């Protein structure tokens, strides 16, 4: 049905870019449609921070739909922190436009080495209102109210390493994205799209561990203790600091990650968090399982999982839509 899929342009399969637009002159912007956060920001012409010299900086004075605020804010992600000040304007995402309260970053120095070396200009959240800094009603939630799209929900379909594109459809569930079945899980809370799963792969079972489906995380995630015993086996190598372990790809002891909620079980095979590391001898590949510690035992199910199952997000259904992405 009628909607609007925002083509996300993959990068080494560990982050994907979209094409946002702000203001009347429709100032273009390479965004990251992230669900781990619920705030939209763009670097301001006032961003005197180096990692800003190499990108599209928003220019208020060039937009007639630019409303002033100026309240200062911060936003802490895993890759760093950014700071600037509130402003409001007409944001565009494909065939849809809407007046949204967003942020103009002025300070991004904290987001290095990530920012200064990537291609996205800013971030556009997609999480829940109570996770946003400011209690900003979520973009997609908004376009629902204003009777602008079939349903209040978006869709995530990503390619692998390369192969083909990926899309972010806002509104309705495009069925050409998954093969057959589609199951739904409640939510624990309305922050990050989070569920109550029993995460495990080896003999490491954990009850109701918090699992956050995240488009903005490029790696899966378990805490330190839950991983220190990961070397209990897995002759995984630890290349110097950053970004994570690298192992041999024809190994034979790497356990299909098992994620299962009572209603249904989701399984992830090694093939998902491997390779390339080819030119650098094609018999080696990167693990792609980082040790991240949030609050409690929070597991970050990022791309790898979304790389297997085509996902559906809905504020209305108030849950996530899991189902095998269809490599077609």
């Amino acid at each position: 049905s009628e909607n609007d899929s925002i083509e996300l342009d993959d990068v080494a399969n560990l982050m994907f870019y979209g094409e946002g637009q702000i203001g009347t002159n429709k100032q273009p912007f390479m965004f990251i449609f992230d669900t781990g956060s619920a705030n939209l920001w763009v670097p301001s012409v006032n961003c005197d921070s180096i990692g800003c010299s190499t990108k599209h900086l928003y220019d208020a004075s060039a937009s007639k739909s630019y409303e002033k605020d100026g309240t200062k804010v911060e936003i802490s992600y895993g890759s760093g922190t950014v700071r600037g000040y509130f402003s409001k304007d007409v944001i565009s995402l494909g065939d849809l436009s809407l007046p949204y309260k967003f942020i103009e970053v002025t300070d991004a120095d904290d987001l290095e080495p990530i920012y200064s070396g990537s291609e996205f200009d800013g971030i556009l959240g997609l999480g829940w209102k109570d996770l946003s800094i400011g209690s900003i009603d979520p973009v997609v939630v908004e376009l629902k109210k204003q009777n602008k799209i079939d349903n209040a929900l978006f869709t995530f379909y990503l390619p692998v390493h390369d192969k083909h594109v990926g899309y972010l459809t806002i509104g309705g569930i495009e069925s050409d994205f998954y093969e057959g079945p589609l199951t739904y899980e409640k939510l624990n809370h309305d922050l990050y799209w989070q569920i109550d799963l029993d995460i495990h792969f080896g003999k490491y079972v954990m009850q109701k561990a918090n699992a956050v489906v995240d488009s903005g995380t490029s790696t899966i995630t378990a805490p330190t203790s839950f991983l220190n015993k990961f070397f209990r086996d897995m002759n995984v190598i630890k290349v110097p600091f950053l970004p994570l372990y690298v192992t041999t790809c024809d190994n034979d002891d790497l356990p299909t990650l098992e994620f299962h909620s009572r209603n249904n079980k989701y399984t992830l095979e090694p093939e998902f968090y491997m390779d390339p590391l080819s030119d650098i001898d094609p018999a080696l590949c990167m693990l792609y399982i980082l040790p991240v510690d949030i609050d409690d035992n929070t597991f970050i199910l990022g791309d790898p999982f979304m790389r297997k199952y085509f996902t559906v997000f809905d504020y209305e259904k108030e849950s996530v839509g899991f189902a095998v992405a269809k490599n077609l």
Binding site: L14, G36, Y77, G78, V292
Partner: peptide
């Protein structure tokens, strides 16, 4: 990579 809010 990136691990997008805390």
């Amino acid at each position: 990579x990136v691990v997008x809010a805390x």
